[PDB]
Amino acid sequence: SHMEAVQNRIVEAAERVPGVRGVIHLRARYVGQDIWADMIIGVDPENTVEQAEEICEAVQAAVCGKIRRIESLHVSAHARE
Amino acid sequence: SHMEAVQNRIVEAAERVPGVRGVIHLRARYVGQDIWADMIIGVDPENTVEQAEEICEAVQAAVCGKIRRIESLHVSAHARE
């Protein structure tokens, strides 16, 4: 499928950012030819809130840099393991 | 452009393989929804022919693994620098 391919690229890109423990949730949708996405990543529970927010920002930068059709990407974090 | 995006992904993927000194040539075309491509990479002139052929095979694996719509990719090598 069309959107399977883009979603697999998003997940892959996110999972390669240091401190990501899996993609918990990804909602990606077409707005014209652009993708708008919302994502939840897992992080180490003992990371600080400041570190988890840095990880989110690094995921946003990595994913947006690799998948050019993404025009909006909201990343938040949840404790995992 | 449509094909600019895929071609930039191909080049980027190739350039991240150890021993690639630039993409010299890339011809990529649609055959239905699949891409068929031919590429020339630069390599160190003092690599052996056996090493250059390993690099080509590594580029083929890397690019094909990252860009799922590619169904044929022919890689050869030319001395660069």
CB pairs under 8 A between A and B: 6
CA distance B70 to A55: 32
Contact between A63 and A35 under an 8 Å Cβ cutoff? The reply is: no
User: What residues form DSSP beta bridges with B74?
Assistant: B38
Resolution (Å) of this entry? 2.0
Please indicate if any CB of chain A lies within 8 Å of the CB of B69.
yes
CA distance A47 to A24: 17
Q: Are B59 and B10 in contact (CB under 8 A)?
A: no
Q: Which of B5, B8, B68 lies nearest to residue A5, judging by beta carbons?
A: B68
Instruction: Look up residue B43 and give its two tokens.
Output: 């390599």
Q: For residue A69, what is the nearest residue in chain B, using CA coordinates? A: B5
Query: Domain containing A75 — which CATH number?
Result: 3.30.70.1350
Residue with tokens 């529970």: A45
Could you give the 3-state DSSP secondary structure of residue A70? strand
- Identify residue A43 by its one-letter amino acid code: V
Which experimental method was this entry solved with?
Answer: X-ray
Q: How many domains are contained in chain A?
A: 1
- The order of strands in the sheet holding A34-43 is A23-31, A34-43, A70-79
B38 and B17 Cβ atoms separated by less than 8 Å: no
Residue numbers of the domain that contains B37? 2-79
Q: Please, what is the angle between helix A49-66 and helix A2-15, to 10°?
A: 140
Residue closest to A75 by CA, chosen among A49, A51, A39, A48: A39
Burial classification of residue A47, based on how many CB atoms lie within 10 Å of its CB (0-12 exposed, 13-18 middle, 19 or more buried): middle
Answer whether A68 touches B (CB < 8 Å). Answer: yes
Rg of chain A on CA atoms, in Å: 12
Q: Tell me which chain B residues have a C-beta less than 8 angstroms from the C-beta of A8.
A: 68
